Amino acid sequence: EDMPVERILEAELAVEPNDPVTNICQAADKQLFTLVEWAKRIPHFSELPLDDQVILLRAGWNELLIASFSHRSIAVKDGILLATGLHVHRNSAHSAGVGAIFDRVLTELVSKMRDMQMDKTELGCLRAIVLFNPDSKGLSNPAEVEALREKVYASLEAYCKHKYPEQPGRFAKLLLRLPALRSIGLKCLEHLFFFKLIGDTPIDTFLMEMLEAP
Amino acid sequence: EDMPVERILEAELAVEPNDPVTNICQAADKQLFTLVEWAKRIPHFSELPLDDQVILLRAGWNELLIASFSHRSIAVKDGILLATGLHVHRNSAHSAGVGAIFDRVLTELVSKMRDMQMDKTELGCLRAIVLFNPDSKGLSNPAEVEALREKVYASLEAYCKHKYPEQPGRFAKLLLRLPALRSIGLKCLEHLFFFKLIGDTPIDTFLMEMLEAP
Amino acid sequence: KHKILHRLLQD
Amino acid sequence: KHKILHRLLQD
Numbered sequence: 120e121d122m123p124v125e126r127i128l129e130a131e132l133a134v135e136p137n138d139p140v141t142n143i144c145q146a147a148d149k150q151l152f153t154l155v156e157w158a159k160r161i162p163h164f165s166e167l168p169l170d171d172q173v174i175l176l177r178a179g180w181n182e183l184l185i186a187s188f189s190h191r192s193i194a195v196k197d198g199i200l201l202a203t204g205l206h207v208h209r210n211s212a213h214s215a216g217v218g219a220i221f222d223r224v225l226t227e228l229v230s231k232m233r234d235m236q237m238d239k240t241e242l243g244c245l246r247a248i249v250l251f252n253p254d255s256k257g258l259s260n261p262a263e264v265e266a267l268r269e270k271v272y273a274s275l276e277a278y279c280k281h282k283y284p285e286q287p288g289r290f291a292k293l294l295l296r297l298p299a300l301r302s303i304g305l306k307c308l309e310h311l312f313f314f315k316l317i318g319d320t321p322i323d324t325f326l327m328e329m330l331e332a333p
Numbered sequence: 334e335d336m337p338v339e340r341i342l343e344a345e346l347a348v349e350p351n352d353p354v355t356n357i358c359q360a361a362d363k364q365l366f367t368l369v370e371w372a373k374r375i376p377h378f379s380e381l382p383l384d385d386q387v388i389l390l391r392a393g394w395n396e397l398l399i400a401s402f403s404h405r406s407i408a409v410k411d412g413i414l415l416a417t418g419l420h421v422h423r424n425s426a427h428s429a430g431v432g433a434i435f436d437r438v439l440t441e442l443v444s445k446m447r448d449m450q451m452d453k454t455e456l457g458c459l460r461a462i463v464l465f466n467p468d469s470k471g472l473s474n475p476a477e478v479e480a481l482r483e484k485v486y487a488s489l490e491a492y493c494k495h496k497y498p499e500q501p502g503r504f505a506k507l508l509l510r511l512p513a514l515r516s517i518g519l520k521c522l523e524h525l526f527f528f529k530l531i532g533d534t535p536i537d538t539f540l541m542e543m544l545e546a547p
Numbered sequence: 548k549h550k551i552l553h554r555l556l557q558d
Numbered sequence: 559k560h561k562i563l564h565r566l567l568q569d
């Protein structure tokens with residue numbers, strides 16, 4: 120209740136209108152600023168105590184961004200579209216040493232989003248659910264964050280069973296990409312931690328801050 | 334269609350009536366045999382080509398077993414119940430060096446399963462969905478495996494919206510533990526790979542086979 | 548590979 | 559810690 124899909128969609132439309140790995144890290148730092156503004160546009164998110172807002176964003180920033188550039192890449196042939204406006208083809212990513220993860224992104228996320236034609240409203244609700252992760256360690260009131268998560272998918276299901284009546288399994292099919300997003304979110308994080316360790320691959324301040332402790 | 338929740342429940346009832354880490358690895362090897370019999374009891378699972386049956390089990394054995402001992406541990410105070418009949422208390426697991434993961438199991442899985450009172454029929458359908466992972470690499474017909482996954486949660490939702498009419502968000506709440514199960518499934522796997530590397534901690538043949546390549 | 552798994556699935 | 563994140567959230 121009090122979690123309209125319209126406010127969520129607006130949040131999605133409001134924020135978004137040589138080494139392939141470097142370009143990706145730069146695009147990630149860039150989007151981290153936009154991610155905060157986005158979250159602020161999510162209903163009741165700003166009513167949470169600052170500390171809890173920090174925990175939620177630091178907990179899902181990686182999954183929230185991977186989902187976004189994937190959906191944006193639905194029109195791309197064999198690759199993804201970066202916020203910076205650059206394309207990263209599968210062959211290019213492969214020649215950089217991150218072909219395994221890249222393929223998982225195209226196969227488990229991009230392709231699947233394209234086949235069911237996930238709309239922006241559906242994307243938004245999914246990211247909102249990811250944002251409202253009640254399992255986040257440190258939350259001063261997990262039950263509260265839990266309450267918001269349920270309100271989000273309550274609106275999403277209503278949206279689906281109203282926009283796509285012919286597809287009664289669309290709602291479940293949307294939630295069934297979260298496990299893959301969690302898995303891919305974790306692998307990507309491993310890569311970032313390795314890149315930081317090695318030294319090569321420039322990492323900006325905000326992206327760098329996210330790789331802090333915990 | 335042709336995926337009754339009764340067959341699934343029966344499958345769950347049919348299979349199940351000093352170092353804490355060692356006892357856990359032994360219990361894992363033990364359950365791996367029971368897992369196969371279980372799967373065979375899952376509708377249409379045996380109609381898939383042997384090679385695909387191998388891929389599906391090797392892909393989800395870890396999540397399928399973690400979910401099962403967690404649900405079984407719902408009655409436990411602060412710990413889990415092993416198939417072997419042994420209890421592993423949180424303090425004990427902590428003193429073994431696996432306290433971080435153990436806590437995540439009690440907090441994100443056991444506790445959450447206890448609060449909503451997930452029933453065996455719900456547990457079964459969830460594991461069935463995990464078993465039918467269409468993202469598994471190597472599948473000769475992913476679309477087919479995909480079809481079965483949808484039939485499973487189609488029956489589960491019907492079951493829920495018939496057994497717990499007062500809780501319209503129960504279905505989604507069940508699927509919303511998969512991301513956590515995927516995450517916890519991966520961390521546990523890391524531990525097993527480390528234990529094998531180090532040398533200590535005896536690992537039986539079947540458990541050992543699962544840690545093969547890929 | 549997967550010697551045991553195959554045997555248990557065939558039986 | 560989380561210097562930048564806090565600033566962007568407060569503004």
Ligand SMILES: CC(=C/C=C/C(C)=C/C(=O)O)/C=C1\CCCCc2ccccc21
Binds near residue numbers: 144148202308
């Ligand atoms: C964690 C991450 C944030 C994505 C940022 C973007 C791209 C934002 C935007 O441009 O929309 C994803 C990464 C960066 C770490 C290396 C592994 C990796 C491999 C293939 C594709 C992406 C990634």
Ligand SMILES: CC(=C/C=C/C(C)=C/C(=O)O)/C=C1\CCCCc2ccccc21
Binds near residue numbers: 360361426431521
């Ligand atoms: C992967 C795994 C299979 C579980 C097997 C059982 C327990 C089966 C049953 O007795 O029902 C889970 C493990 C084993 C690896 C070490 C990390 C770990 C830490 C805490 C709890 C469990 C685990």
